[PDB]
RNA sequence: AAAAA
């Protein structure tokens, strides 16, 4: 059979990975993951609309001494194939730079961006992560006081 | 090592899928998908919070002659494992009930629910779909008029 | 809030 199999699904990581690749829609959630994981390497995949947010994340990362790859851009946030291709490129680029353990944080972007990132993570044998939060009812944004680093799959 | 040989594309057919399983957050998108695919069977996975919306979808479907399975429930929308288990059961239940071509619509529910549904679809060799819209910047809502059925993955 | 909004 050629059918895919997911032997380890779910769970929580509360720190390890030294590299993280993000799909990007906002800057605050990747900045939180950066503070939790303290990676030495970072990859970023964004859209035209979220490019500025991704550049804000990279600017904070560089001032902490993190090696940043990207932001790479996808032309269509609805297309899972473009996000798969760009995340797979960054995972390869991080590995060729010496990065060992890498995770893909697929929280940001539209669902096809996250699903393409997941497929690229699975094809590379790397873990996929998701930042679970409750919604801040009074500030109308994710409540990062509630943030938990959940694990989607560990190949 | 998993591999995804067929990723992306656009789907336009009222006869390709006999059944659709939804992860549920709202009733509007599943009702749109029902109209487009016109399935004979439907499965539904919900949380305690989205159970009422899933029941609204089921009620509409029953009155159109669709055989509805579920809603099954997951305790936590942030955990992929429960959604994966419940979608896997529904895919099996639909196959046992006579449904030969099933899709999983990933659009609804929290992202971990969708990711669990994707993993169950892949393990069952069934296709995953997404309802793409452009943002209706006038109403600050997804623009349902722009809705197109996207293919996420088509397992071999 | 759970269709990047």
């Amino acid at each position: 059979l050629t059918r895919n199999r997911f032997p380890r699904v779910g769970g929580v990581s509360e720190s390890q990975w030294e590299g993280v690749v993000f799909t990007v829609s906002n800057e605050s959630v990747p900045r939180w993951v950066m503070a939790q994981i303290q990676p030495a390497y970072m990859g970023l995949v964004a859209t035209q609309a979220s490019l500025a947010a991704a550049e804000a994340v990279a600017a904070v990362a560089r001032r902490r001494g993190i090696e940043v790859h990207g932001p790479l851009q996808v032309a269509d946030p609805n297309d899972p194939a473009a996000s798969r291709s760009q995340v797979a490129l960054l995972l390869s680029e991080l590995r060729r730079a010496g990065c060992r353990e890498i995770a893909v944080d697929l929280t940001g972007g539209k669902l096809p961006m996250s699903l393409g990132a997941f497929m690229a993570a699975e094809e590379a044998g790397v873990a996929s992560l998701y930042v679970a939060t409750d919604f801040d009812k009074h500030l109308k944004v994710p409540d990062m006081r509630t943030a938990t680093l959940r694990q989607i799959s560990q190949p």
Side-chain angles (χ1 to χ4, degrees), chain A residues 16-99 101-105:
Chain A
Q16 311 273 103
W17 306 276
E18 52 160 7
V20 180
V21 175
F22 296 96
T23 48
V24 180
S25 54
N26 64 81
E27 76 176 78
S28 53
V29 178
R31 288 175 69 164
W32 182 84
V33 173
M34 288 179 38
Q36 300 302 309
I37 293 183
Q38 295 184 79
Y41 303 79
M42 172 165 328
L44 297 164
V45 173
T47 67
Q48 290 185 212
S50 67
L51 181 61
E55 293 169 323
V57 174
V60 179
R62 291 206 156 79
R63 279 153 185 88
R64 304 175 161 198
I66 297 167
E67 183 180 301
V68 180
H69 300 255
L72 300 182
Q73 287 170 85
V74 298
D76 184 356
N78 292 312
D79 166 37
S83 287
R84 199 255 304 244
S85 173
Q86 295 290 60
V87 169
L89 179 43
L90 287 178
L91 290 173
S92 161
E93 188 175 308
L94 264 61
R95 280 230 184 79
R96 293 183 332 252
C99 186
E101 305 273 308
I102 312 178
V104 170
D105 175 1

Side-chain angles (χ1 to χ4, degrees), chain A residues 5-7 91 117-128 152-155:
Chain A
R5 275 259 139 212
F6 305 90
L91 290 173
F118 176 73
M119 291 186 277
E122 285 289 311
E123 288 183 333
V126 316
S128 40
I152 303 300
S153 176
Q154 171 63 77

Side-chain angles (χ1 to χ4, degrees), chain A residues 11-14 32 130-133 144-150:
Chain A
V12 169
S13 55
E14 201 98 19
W32 182 84
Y130 173 81
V131 179
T133 59
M144 304 310 299
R145 301 168 297 193
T146 71
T148 303
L149 190 58
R150 287 236 152 226

